Amino acid sequence: WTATSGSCKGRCFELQEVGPPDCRCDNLCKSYSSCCHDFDELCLKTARGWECTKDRCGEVRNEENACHCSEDCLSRGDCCTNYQVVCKGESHWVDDDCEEIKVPECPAGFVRPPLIIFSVDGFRASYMKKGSKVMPNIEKLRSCGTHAPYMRPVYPTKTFPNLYTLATGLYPESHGIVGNSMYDPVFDASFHLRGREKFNHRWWGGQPLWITATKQGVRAGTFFWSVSIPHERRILTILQWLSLPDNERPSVYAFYSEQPDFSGHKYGPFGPEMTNPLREIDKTVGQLMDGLKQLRLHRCVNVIFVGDHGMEDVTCDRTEFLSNYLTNVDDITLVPGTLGRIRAKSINNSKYDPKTIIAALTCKKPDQHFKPYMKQHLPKRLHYANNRRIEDIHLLVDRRWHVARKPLDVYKKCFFQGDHGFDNKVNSMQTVFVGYGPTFKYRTKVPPFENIELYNVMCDLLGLKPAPNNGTHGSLNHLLRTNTFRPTMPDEVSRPNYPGIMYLQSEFDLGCTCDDKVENKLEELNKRLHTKGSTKERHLLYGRPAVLYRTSYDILYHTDFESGYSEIFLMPLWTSYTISKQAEVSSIPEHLTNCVRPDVRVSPGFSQNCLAYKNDKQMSYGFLFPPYLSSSPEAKYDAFLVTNMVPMYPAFKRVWAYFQRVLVKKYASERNGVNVISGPIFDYNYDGLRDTEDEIKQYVEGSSIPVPTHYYSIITSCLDFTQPADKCDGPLSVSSFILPHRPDNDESCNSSEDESKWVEELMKMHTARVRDIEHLTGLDFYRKTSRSYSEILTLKTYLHTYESE
Ligand SMILES: *[C@@H]1O[C@H](CO)[C@@H](O[C@@H]2O[C@H](CO)[C@@H](O[C@@H]3O[C@H](CO[C@H]4O[C@H](CO[C@H]5O[C@H](CO)[C@@H](O)[C@H](O)[C@@H]5O)[C@@H](O)[C@H](O[C@H]5O[C@H](CO)[C@@H](O)[C@H](O)[C@@H]5O[C@H]5O[C@H](CO)[C@@H](O)[C@H](O)[C@@H]5O)[C@@H]4O)[C@@H](O)[C@H](O[C@H]4O[C@H](CO)[C@@H](O)[C@H](O)[C@@H]4O[C@H]4O[C@H](CO)[C@@H](O)[C@H](O)[C@@H]4O)[C@@H]3O)[C@H](O)[C@H]2NC(C)=O)[C@H](O)[C@H]1NC(C)=O
Ligand SMILES: CC(=O)N1CCN(c2ccc3nc(C)n(CC(=O)NCc4ccc(Cl)c(Cl)c4)c(=O)c3c2)CC1
Ligand SMILES: [Ca+2]
Ligand SMILES: [Cl-]
Numbered sequence: 001w002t003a004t005s006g007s008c009k010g011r012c013f014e015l016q017e018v019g020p021p022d023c024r025c026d027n028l029c030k031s032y033s034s035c036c037h038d039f040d041e042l043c044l045k046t047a048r049g050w051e052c053t054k055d056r057c058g059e060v061r062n063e064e065n066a067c068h069c070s071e072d073c074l075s076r077g078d079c080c081t082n083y084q085v086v087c088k089g090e091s092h093w094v095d096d097d098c099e100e101i102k103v104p105e106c107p108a109g110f111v112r113p114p115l116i117i118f119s120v121d122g123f124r125a126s127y128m129k130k131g132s133k134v135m136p137n138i139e140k141l142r143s144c145g146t147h148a149p150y151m152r153p154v155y156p157t158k159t160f161p162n163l164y165t166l167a168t169g170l171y172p173e174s175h176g177i178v179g180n181s182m183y184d185p186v187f188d189a190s191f192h193l194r195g196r197e198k199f200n201h202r203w204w205g206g207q208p209l210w211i212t213a214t215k216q217g218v219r220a221g222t223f224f225w226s227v228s229i230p231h232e233r234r235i236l237t238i239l240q241w242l243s244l245p246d247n248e249r250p251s252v253y254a255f256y257s258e259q260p261d262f263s264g265h266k267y268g269p270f271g272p273e274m275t276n277p278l279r280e281i282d283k284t285v286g287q288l289m290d291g292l293k294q295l296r297l298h299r300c301v302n303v304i305f306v307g308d309h310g311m312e313d314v315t316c317d318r319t320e321f322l323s324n325y326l327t328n329v330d331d332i333t334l335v336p337g338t339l340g341r342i343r344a345k346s347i348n349n350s351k352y353d354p355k356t357i358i359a360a361l362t363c364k365k366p367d368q369h370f371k372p373y374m375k376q377h378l379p380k381r382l383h384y385a386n387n388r389r390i391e392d393i394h395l396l397v398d399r400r401w402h403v404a405r406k407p408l409d410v411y412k413k414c415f416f417q418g419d420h421g422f423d424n425k426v427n428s429m430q431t432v433f434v435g436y437g438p439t440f441k442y443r444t445k446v447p448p449f450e451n452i453e454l455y456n457v458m459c460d461l462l463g464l465k466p467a468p469n470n471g472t473h474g475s476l477n478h479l480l481r482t483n484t485f486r487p488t489m490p491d492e493v494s495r496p497n498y499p500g501i502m503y504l505q506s507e508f509d510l511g512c513t514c515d516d517k518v519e520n521k522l523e524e525l526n527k528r529l530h531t532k533g534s535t536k537e538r539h540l541l542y543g544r545p546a547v548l549y550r551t552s553y554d555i556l557y558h559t560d561f562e563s564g565y566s567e568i569f570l571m572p573l574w575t576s577y578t579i580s581k582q583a584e585v586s587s588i589p590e591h592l593t594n595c596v597r598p599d600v601r602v603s604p605g606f607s608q609n610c611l612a613y614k615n616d617k618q619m620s621y622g623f624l625f626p627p628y629l630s631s632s633p634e635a636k637y638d639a640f641l642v643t644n645m646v647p648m649y650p651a652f653k654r655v656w657a658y659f660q661r662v663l664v665k666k667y668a669s670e671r672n673g674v675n676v677i678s679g680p681i682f683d684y685n686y687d688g689l690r691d692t693e694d695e696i697k698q699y700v701e702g703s704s705i706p707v708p709t710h711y712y713s714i715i716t717s718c719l720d721f722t723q724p725a726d727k728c729d730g731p732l733s734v735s736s737f738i739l740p741h742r743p744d745n746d747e748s749c750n751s752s753e754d755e756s757k758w759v760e761e762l763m764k765m766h767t768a769r770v771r772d773i774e775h776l777t778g779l780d781f782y783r784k785t786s787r788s789y790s791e792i793l794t795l796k797t798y799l800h801t802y803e804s805e
C-alpha cells in the first residue's frame with residue numbers, strides 16, 4: 001500500500017528514497033508504481049520541448065516549461081542544453097576542436113572530477129566504425145579520449161548480468177545475476193526483466209559502485225532509471241544534480257539508454273531501421289556534453305561511454321527444438337533462447353536423470369546448432385558454474401541460433417531479427433568502451449579488455465578503495481593519465497626445497513620398470529651441471545612461479561625442463577620448458593614405451609607408483625614435459641621420471657599427445673620459439689579457485705595420487721617474432737588453455753577422426769587467461785621480466801579468442 005496523497009513539491013528526483021507508506025519522488029518511483037499523485041505534473045514537465053529557440057531567449061521564466069531559456073537559467077541549473085548555443089553565441093561541444101585536458105578544470109567547490117557513466121544497451125562494437133557518419137559526438141569522444149577497439153562482455157551476454165558486472169567487477173556467478181531470467185531453488189522464485197521480483201535485494205550480491213562510493217563518503221546518483229522517464233529528462237536531471245550545493249551533490253552519475261538494443265532485436269544489428277536509433281543516442285550524448293559545457297564542467301568530468309553487449313542476427317526459423325531430441329520433453333524446464341539451461345520440471349523428482357538428458361542431446365544431428373554441457377565442463381573462461389541459480393545442464397548455442405523446448409513455445413509464447421546472449425568471445429557480442437576526461441589519456445587507443453576490469457578503474461577515478469572483485473587491479477592503469485593505484489606482486493608464501501641425490505634405486509618399490517641400463521668424465525660433469533640448474537635460464541624464462549599458499553614442494557632441474565614438484569599432490573604444480581624454432585620432434589623409442597624411472601632426488605614416500613596405474617583400469621598416465629621434444633636421446637630419459645608423470649584418462653591422452661607431439665612444435669615454428677609452462681588443476685567444486693587437498697573427490701585407484709580436473713598450458717613468446725622466445729628484449733605474447741580432463745571426448749563430435757581434425761578446435765574453445773590459471777593453481781607467473789608490472793598485469797588478463805578480425 002502507498003499513501004500517494006503526499007506531494008513532490010520541492011522533491012523532484014530527490015536522491016534519498018523514502019520508506020512506505022509515504023510516497024516517492026525519485027527516478028525509480030515509476031517502476032515501483034509509488035510516485036506521489038503530483039509526480040508527473042511537477043517532475044515530468046514537457047511543455048515547449050527540450051530545445052531553446054531564438055524567440056525564447058531571455059524569456060520570462062515559466063515554471064511549466066520542460067527546460068528554460070530565461071536569463072536566470074544557468075544560476076538555477078535548468079536551462080535547455082542548447083541554451084548557450086541559441087541565446088549566447090556559443091558553439092556545440094561537438095563543433096569545438098579537441099584540446100588535451102592535462103589537468104581537471106573544475107569550478108570552485110569541486111573536490112574531485114565527477115564521473116558520469118553513459119551505458120548503452122546492445123551497442124555492438126562495430127557500430128563505432130559502421131555508424132561513424134551518424135554519430136559525431138560519440139566519434140569525438142572516441143577519437144579525443146581513450147578507446148578500445150572493443151570490450152569483452154561477460155557470459156551470458158545479456159543485459160542484467162552485464163550491467164551488474166559493470167557495477168561490481170564480479171562474474172555473474174559471484175554477483176548472482178546469472179541471467180535476464182533465473183530461478184533460485186532456495187527462494188523457490190523466478191527473476192525476470194519485467195515484474196516486481198527483481199526489486200528484491202536478495203538477488204543482488206557483491207557491492208556495486210554506488211554502495212562502495214556511499215560507504216566511503218562519496219555520494220552517488222541512482223544507476224537504475226524508470227523506463228517512462230524520457231532520455232532528455234534523464235540528462236536534465238543529471239545536469240540539475242550537478243548544480244546542487246557541494247555537500248549535497250553526487251560525485252558519480254549514471255545514464256542508461258535502452259537503445260540501440262530495443263530496435264536491434266526488431267530489425268537485426270544492421271537493419272536499415274538502425275540508423276535513426278544511433279542518431280538519437282548521439283544527440284543525447286551531445287545534449288549531455290553541451291549541458292556540461294554550459295556548467296563549465298566539460299573539462300572537469302570524466303565520462304565513460306560503455307555498452308553491455310552486442311547484437312547478432314537471429315530469427316524464428318533458426319531455432320533448435322528439444323522436442324526433436326528428447327522423448328520426455330515435458331519432464332524438463334528450459335530457460336530458452338541464445339543459451340539453454342535445463343532443470344527437472346518437478347523439483348525433488350528422484351527419477352529425472354541428467355546423464356540421460358545430456359546423452360540424448362549430444363552429437364545427434366550433423367548440423368546441430370547447440371552443445372550440451374554439465375556446467376562444471378563449460379570452458380573455465382566463462383566462469384559460469386558456481387551459483388545455485390545456474391542449472392546443472394547448460395546448452396551453449398551457436399551464434400545466430402536459438403534453442404527452445406517445443407515448437408508451440410516459438411509460435412505461441414517472427415517478431416524479431418536480432419538477439420544476444422551467446423559465448424562472450426563471439427565477435428557480434430563484443431561491445432564498446434570510451435573514456436573521456438582529465439583522468440583518461442588523450443587520443444589513445446588501448447587493447448581490448450574485459451568489462452570485469454572497469455569497476456577497479458571507476459574506483460580509482462573516484463578515490464575509492466574497491467571491494468574484492470574479479471578485476472586485476474593495475475591491468476588497466478594504461479588507460480589513465482594519473483593512477484592512484486600502484487600494483488605490486490603478491491608475496492611468495494612457500495619457498496621451495498632444492499633436493500639433491502638422496503635415495504638409492506633399491507629404496508623404491510613403485511612397481512615401475514624401464515630399460516635404461518645402457519651405460520665418461522666429459523658428459524658426467526655436464527649432466528650434473530644440468531641437474532644443478534645450468535640450463536635453467538633457457539627453460540625458465542620469466543623466473544620461477546611463486547607459490548601463494550602454504551605447501552611443501554621441490555624445484556627439480558633437468559637438461560630440457562624445470563619443475564616445481566608438490567610432495568602433497570605427488571606431481572608437479574608446474575613444468576617449464578623452452579622449444580626453439582629449430583627444435584626437432586623425435587619418437588618415444590620402442591624400448592622405452594612403458595618406461596617410468598624413480599627420481600633419486602625425491603623419497604619413495606612422496607612419489608607416485610606404477611602399480612596404482614596398472615590396477616586402475618580407467619586411469620592411465622602422461623608426462624608434463626613431452627619425451628617427443630627431448631634435446632638428445634640421453635636427455636630423453638629425464639622425461640620418463642616418475643616426478644614428470646601425471647594421471648590421464650586414455651581419452652584425454654589422445655588430446656594431450658597431439659598437443660605435445662604436433663602442436664607445440666607448430667607454435668614454436670609460427671612464433672619463433674615458445675616457452676611452455678604446463679601443469680594440473682584441481683577444481684572439483686567448480687569455483688574457479690585451487691582446491692585444497694581435502695576437496696579432492698577422485699584418486700588413482702588405491703593410492704593417494706589425486707586426479708586433476710583440468711590440465712593447463714601457458715605458451716609465451718616474443719611479441720616481436722623476429723626475436724626468438726629465449727632472447728626477447730621487449731613485450732611478450734601469450735596464449736593459454738585449460739583443458740578439461742575428461743574420460744570421454746563426447747564434447748568433440750568429430751573425435752572418431754584423426755586428432756588433426758578436432759583437437760585444436762577443442763583447445764581453442766578452452767582458451768584461457770593466465771589470470772584464470774593463477775586463480776586455479778595459487779601460482780603467480782612472470783615474476784622476473786624486464787617489463788613493467790602493469791604491462792605484465794595486462795598480459796595476464798589477455799585472452800587469445802581465435803575469432804576472425
Ligand atoms: C571473484 O571475486 C569474488 C570476490 O572477491 C570471489 O568471491 C569470494 O570468494 C571467497 C572464497 O570462496 C568468499 O569468501 C567466503 O565468504 C563467506 C561469507 O560470505 C558472505 O559474506 C560476504 C561479505 O559481504 C560483505 O562484504 C564486505 C566485506 O568484504 C562487508 O563490509 C559488507 O558488509 C558486505 O555485505 C558476501 O560477499 C557473500 O556473498 C555471497 O553470498 C550471497 C548468497 O547467499 C550472494 O548474495 C552473493 O552473490 C555471494 O554469492 C556468491 O558467493 C558465495 C560464497 O560466499 C557462493 O556460494 C555463491 O554461489 C555466489 O558465488 C556472503 O554474503 C565466508 O563465510 C566463507 O568462509 C568459510 O570458508 C572459509 C574457507 O577457508 C573458512 O576459513 C571459513 O571459516 C568458513 O568456513 C565455515 O563455513 C563454511 C560454510 O560456508 C563451512 O563449510 C565450514 O565448515 C565452516 O563453518 C568464505 O570466506 C567470498 O564470499 C566471495 N565473495 C563473493 C562476493 O562472491 C571469487 O572467488 C572470485 N572468482 C574467481 C574465479 O577468482
Ligand atoms: C540492487 C538494488 O539496489 N535494487 C533496487 C532497485 N531494483 C530495481 C528497481 C527498479 C527498476 N526499474 C527498472 C526499469 N529497471 C531496469 C533498469 O534500470 N535497467 C538499467 C540498469 C542500470 C544499471 C544496472 Cl546495474 C542494471 Cl542491472 C540495469 C531495474 O533494473 C530496476 C531495478 C533492483 C534491485
Ligand atoms: Ca576449487
Ligand atoms: Cl537468461
Ligand SMILES: [K+]
Pocket residue numbers: 613614615616617618619620
Ligand atoms: K590403468
Ligand SMILES: [Zn+2]
Pocket residue numbers: 122159261262265420
Ligand atoms: Zn536485448
